[PDB]
Amino acid sequence: AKNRLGTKALNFTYTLDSGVKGTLYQFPAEYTLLFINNPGCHACAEMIEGLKASPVINGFTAAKKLKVLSIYPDEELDEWKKHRNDFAKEWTNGYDKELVIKNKNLYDLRAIPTLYLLDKNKTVLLKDATLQKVEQYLAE
């Protein structure tokens, strides 16, 4: 259902810098914050900084309830490899090796960077949310 609220987000395979493979559906977390990024941009840098600074998100990450899964869906692997240490080490930072998200239109990429907040089953709690909307939801 194209990642609409209250439906299961679409699965995909990510590859880490180490070459390890995993999927969204295999990723364990009470809350997954899916962060679709192309770190070749200014809005992305500020979203990284915002996620690192956020009191609310930091409380949830420290309590082991929320995990950030960053996913790069585009072709510039060398540049992603260039920007990979921009991400917090604690986050799970991967790329879409096969370009499945793009080629199968699994997620709307027009306005990257984009956040989805997912529950333990990968049901969409927030679709294409701002950081402040994620904070508001979690502070409830």
Range of the domain at 93: 1-140
Strand partners, 66: 31
- How many angstroms is the resolution? 1.3
3-state secondary structure of 13: strand
Q: How many Å apart are CA 84 and CA 94, to the nearest integer?
A: 9
Q: Which amino acid is at 83?
A: H
Q: How many domains does the chain have?
A: 1
How many alpha carbons lie under 13 Å from residue 107 in its C-beta half-sphere? 28
- List the one residue out of 49, 58, 47 whose CA is nearest residue 115: 47
Q: How was this structure determined?
A: X-ray
Report, in angstroms and rounded to the nearest whole number, the Rg of the chain calculated over CA atoms: 14
Structure tokens, 121 = 């089953």
**Taking the CB of residue 137, how many other CB atoms lie within 10 A of it?**
14
Q: How many Å apart are CA 24 and CA 20, to the nearest integer?
A: 13
CATH classification at residue 55: 3.40.30.10
